[PDB]
RNA sequence: GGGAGCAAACCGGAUUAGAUACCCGGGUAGUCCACGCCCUAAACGAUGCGCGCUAGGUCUCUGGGUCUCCUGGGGGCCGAAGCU
RNA sequence: GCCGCGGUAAUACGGAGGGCGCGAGCGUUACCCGGAUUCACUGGGCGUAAAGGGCGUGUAGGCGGCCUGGGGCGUCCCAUGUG
């Protein structure tokens, strides 16, 4: 069990004789606040059900956010489909300047100071998965040269 | 077309030295020969356009060369262009 | 006919790497080896060496990759996740000593040509100079 | 002892319908077929069994699978003759990946396995007597080797990976050491402990699978003679 | 200049509520040639040109060889990585 | 303001009770930059979304393989004037 704050909830719909049938999509974020965040998108016949599943699916999908002093290790641009996103680390006591999404995710990420911006499609879902792959691609001076050993 | 025999005459006539199967002087002399030939042709088959195209290329290619020549060396440029009697 | 040989070298490298190959052979070029030397002197590649494909002198460039991975797509991470030329022939890119780039918040590099040799985003800065911002790796 | 056996008739397989990745494991193309390089094979066999051994001695269960006919039977053997779970029939989808749910059937097995011997048989209409009895025939028809341990494997051994790559996948998403005997018609990369060598000729399958189970037992105590291999083996 | 066949327009016949159409019977310019204009198009791969780099499998047209194969040029299908 | 509201139970009109905001001010109309990576150097594009010229030849122009040496215009550094 972590923070567990849901990005967005919606009501999709499908067609069939007699009428349209519904379902619900819930996108949730789950982070401890020490460098662990998970992103799960849950769909099911009812809001609650959706919600929960999002959580479950989330925990089952997390990532080690290599924080540092309260911000990200370095600048990063990540294109994911139509969506794009920039992430720039700000000096301590700066703020988490990002839109609803990258925030909600980055808040639990553990970061307290980071500069951002949504580029291209601002779609939640996609920016969401966008933010993830962003983090999931960060590096530290250590694990950096840790690779260039030789 | 052009007999191997006649084609040679040209080559042997412009070779900057014994042998010399290629080179500017030559490549040019040769193109020319082909050009006029082809020229005289179309001067009869106006309707034969596709072949016309071929001329142009042959034509430009020669332009190119001379340009290089003129650049690299004027002396034997005037020479060649003169002997072939070109640039009208 | 290759307009910018350098941008090529990178691309050849950027491609061979993206597939995980032992070594790649970029055509001989003093100035090229420089970006190479530096590329290695900074630990991005096992190294390189001169060769000859029938009177055709190239340069074997040994690529360095990471450790195998756990899970789907067990494809080993790479040492160079990104190389991209800056100063292109279609738009020369020069920088003053105060203008030199800060590649990947320091984790990165930025090879560049200077009046006094080929240095990097730190070296050149230390030498306190400037020149054609050749490119950036990291 | 090793070489000879293999060199015997257990190498070189699929021809001209390969995978370039697997180009590191192959000597040449004789009259068409790809002659896998045993020299290297050996080396790999090592690291593989090393792992097996470094696991067979630490109380770890392994799951073997082979859904191809030219290798079914044997796999059924080597498994029971080692207490290691296995799959000889249709490798259900989401086994490892949806274990908890697949298990649900395993439980349904005994659910009947018990109602099998009972006085409740006195009643019950022929409708069910046939329904259940049948519902068990198949039930029992697929889990005969997928029950034993009610816990995921620490690894999985397999014949032709690509043939059962689906299992493999499941395994890989769940992080589970993958070991298998693959030939030239397969991609290594997504295989952890690769046993390069023929995947159809039961000749090679038996061998590589045999010395495997023994090795599983050498780390348990009870070295004996081989298992029933010949019965119609050519 | 030439003119068989076909055929906008056109005239009949049907169909239809009407039928300035689809179907039927006729029919001119045109379609052909020479020379000269017009210069448009779903002028389409709806994909500018040049060069370099990045798994294979398959069938097919064409060239060469100390020709079950190797190597060069072109057209199709399936598809690595990657792109969308 | 954009989406839209009102067809006899309107949280959208009009009045009321209440509430939110800012306060000697509060609103409205106009105009400039922003958000607009929506003219894109930073920082975009053209197979089907708007976008490849019907095709070719070629002038100016733009761009240019490998190695050694001279000049040092671009470029880069220092100092000084200036600002």
Curated annotation (Swiss-Prot), chain A:
One of its GO terms (cellular component) is small ribosomal subunit. Keywords: Ribonucleoprotein, Ribosomal protein, RNA-binding, rRNA-binding. Transmembrane segments: none annotated. GO terms for molecular function: rRNA binding; structural constituent of ribosome. GO terms for biological process: translation. Residues 2-65 form the S5 DRBM domain. Pfam families: Ribosomal_S5, Ribosomal_S5_C. It comes from the Bacteria. Belongs to the universal ribosomal protein uS5 family. With S4 and S12 plays an important role in translational accuracy. Located at the back of the 30S subunit body where it stabilizes the conformation of the head with respect to the body. Binds mRNA in the 70S ribosome, positioning it for translation. Is positioned such that it could physically interact with spectinomycin. PANTHER family: MITOCHONDRIAL RIBOSOMAL PROTEIN S5 (PTHR48277:SF1). The N-terminal domain interacts with the head of the 30S subunit; the C-terminal domain interacts with the body and contacts protein S4. The interaction surface between S4 and S5 is involved in control of translational fidelity. This is Small ribosomal subunit protein uS5.
Curated annotation (Swiss-Prot), chain B:
This is Small ribosomal subunit protein uS15. The keyword rRNA-binding applies. One of the primary rRNA binding proteins, it binds directly to 16S rRNA where it helps nucleate assembly of the platform of the 30S subunit by binding and bridging several RNA helices of the 16S rRNA. GO terms for molecular function: rRNA binding; structural constituent of ribosome. The lineage of its organism: Bacteria, Thermotogati, Deinococcota, Deinococci, Thermales. PROSITE patterns: RIBOSOMAL_S15. Pfam families: Ribosomal_S15. One of its GO terms (biological process) is translation. Belongs to the universal ribosomal protein uS15 family. Keywords: Ribonucleoprotein, Ribosomal protein, RNA-binding, rRNA-binding. The keyword Magnesium does not apply. InterPro entries: Ribosomal_uS15, Ribosomal_uS15_bac-type, uS15_NS1_RNA-bd_sf. Gene3D superfamilies: 6.10.250.3130, S15/NS1, RNA-binding. Part of the 30S ribosomal subunit. Forms a bridge to the 50S subunit in the 70S ribosome, contacting the 23S rRNA. One of its GO terms (cellular component) is cytosolic small ribosomal subunit. It comes from Thermus thermophilus (strain ATCC 27634 / DSM 579 / HB8).
UniProtKB/Swiss-Prot annotation, chain C:
InterPro entries: Ribosomal_uS8, Ribosomal_uS8_CS, Ribosomal_uS8_sf. The keyword Signal does not apply. PROSITE patterns: RIBOSOMAL_S8. GO terms for cellular component: ribonucleoprotein complex; ribosome. GO terms for biological process: translation. Part of the 30S ribosomal subunit. Contacts proteins S2, S5 and S12. PANTHER family: 40S RIBOSOMAL PROTEIN S15A. One of the primary rRNA binding proteins, it binds directly to 16S rRNA where it helps nucleate assembly of the platform of the 30S subunit central domain. The combined cluster of proteins S8, S12 and S17 appears to hold together the shoulder and platform of the 30S subunit. This is Small ribosomal subunit protein uS8. It comes from Thermus thermophilus (strain ATCC 27634 / DSM 579 / HB8). The gene is rpsH.
Swiss-Prot record, chain D:
Belongs to the universal ribosomal protein uS2 family. GO terms for cellular component: cytosolic small ribosomal subunit. The lineage of its organism: Bacteria, Thermotogati, Deinococcota, Deinococci, Thermales. This is Small ribosomal subunit protein uS2. It holds the Pfam family Ribosomal_S2. InterPro entries: Ribosomal_uS2, Ribosomal_uS2_bac/mit/plastid, Ribosomal_uS2_CS, Ribosomal_uS2_flav_dom_sf. Keywords: Coiled coil, Ribonucleoprotein, Ribosomal protein, RNA-binding, rRNA-binding. Spans the head-body hinge region of the 30S subunit. Is loosely associated with the 30S subunit. NCBIfam families: rpsB_bact (TIGR01011). Residues 98-143 form a coiled coil. HAMAP family: Ribosomal_uS2_B (MF_00291_B).
């Amino acid at each position: 069990d972590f923070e567990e704050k849901m990005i967005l909830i919606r009501r999709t719909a499908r067609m069939q004789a007699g009428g349209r049938r519904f379902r619900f999509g819930a996108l949730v974020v789950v982070g401890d606040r020490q460098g662990r965040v998970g992103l799960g998108f849950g769909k099911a016949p009812e809001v609650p059900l959706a919600v929960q599943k999002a959580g479950y699916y989330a925990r089952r999908n997390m990532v080690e956010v290599p924080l540092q002093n309260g911000t990200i290790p370095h600048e990063i641009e990540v294109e994911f489909g139509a969506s794009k996103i920039v992430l720039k680390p700000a000096a301590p006591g700066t703020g988490v300047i990002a839109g609803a999404v990258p925030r909600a995710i980055l808040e639990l990420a553990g970061v307290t100071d980071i500069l951002t911006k949504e580029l291209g499609s601002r779609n939640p879902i996609n920016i969401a998965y966008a933010t993830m792959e962003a983090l999931r691609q960060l590096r530290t001076k250590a694990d950096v040269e840790r690779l260039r050993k030789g | 077309p052009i007999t191997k025999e006649e084609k040679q005459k040209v080559i042997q006539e412009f070779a900057r030295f014994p042998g010399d199967t290629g080179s500017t002087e030559v490549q040019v002399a040769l193109l020319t020969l082909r050009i006029n030939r082809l020229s005289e042709h179309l001067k009869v088959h106006k309707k034969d356009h596709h072949s016309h195209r071929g001329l142009l290329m042959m034509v430009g290619q020669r332009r190119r060369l001379l340009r290089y020549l003129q650049r690299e060396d004027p002396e034997r440029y005037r020479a060649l262009i003169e002997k072939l009697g070109i640039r009208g | 006919m290759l307009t910018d040989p350098i941008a090529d070298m990178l691309t050849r490298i950027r491609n061979a790497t993206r597939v995980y190959k032992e070594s790649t052979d970029v055509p001989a070029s003093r100035f090229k080896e420089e970006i190479l030397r530096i590329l290695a002197r900074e630990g991005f590649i096992k190294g390189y060496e001169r060769v000859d494909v029938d009177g055709k002198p190239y340069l074997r460039v040994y690529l360095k990759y990471g450790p195998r991975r756990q899970g789907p797509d067990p494809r080993p991470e790479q040492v160079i996740h990104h190389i991209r030329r800056i100063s292109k022939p279609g738009r020369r890119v020069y920088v003053g000593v105060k203008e030199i780039p800060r590649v990947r918040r320091g984790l990165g590099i930025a090879i560049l040509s200077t009046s006094k040799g080929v240095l990097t985003d730190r070296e050149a800065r230390k030498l306190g100079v400037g020149g054609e911002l050749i490119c950036e790796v990291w | 002892v090793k070489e000879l056996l293999e060199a015997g008739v257990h190498f070189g397989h699929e021809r001209k319908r390969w995978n370039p990745k697997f180009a590191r494991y192959i000597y040449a193309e004789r009259n068409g077929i790809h002659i896998i390089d045993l020299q290297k094979t050996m080396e790999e066999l090592e690291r593989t069994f090393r792992f097996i051994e470094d696991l067979a001695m630490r109380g770890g269960t392994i799951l073997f699978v082979g859904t191809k006919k030219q290798a079914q039977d044997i796999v059924r053997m080597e498994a029971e003759r080692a207490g290691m779970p296995y799959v000889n029939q249709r490798w259900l989808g989401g086994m490892l990946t949806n274990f908890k749910t697949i298990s649900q059937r395993v439980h349904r097995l005994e659910e009947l396995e018990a109602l099998f011997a009972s006085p409740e048989i006195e009643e019950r209409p022929k409708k069910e007597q046939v329904r259940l009895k049948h519902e068990l025939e198949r039930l029992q028809k697929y889990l005969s080797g997928f029950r034993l341990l009610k816990r995921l494997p620490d690894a999985i051994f397999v014949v032709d990976p690509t043939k059962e790559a689906i299992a493999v996948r499941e395994a890989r998403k769940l992080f589970i050491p993958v070991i298998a005997l693959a030939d030239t018609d397969s991609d290594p990369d997504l295989v952890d402990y690769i046993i390069p060598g023929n995947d159809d000729a039961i000749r090679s399958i038996q061998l590589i699978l045999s010395r495997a189970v023994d090795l599983i037992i050498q780390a348990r105590g009870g070295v004996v003679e081989p298992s029933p291999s010949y019965a119609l083996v050519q």
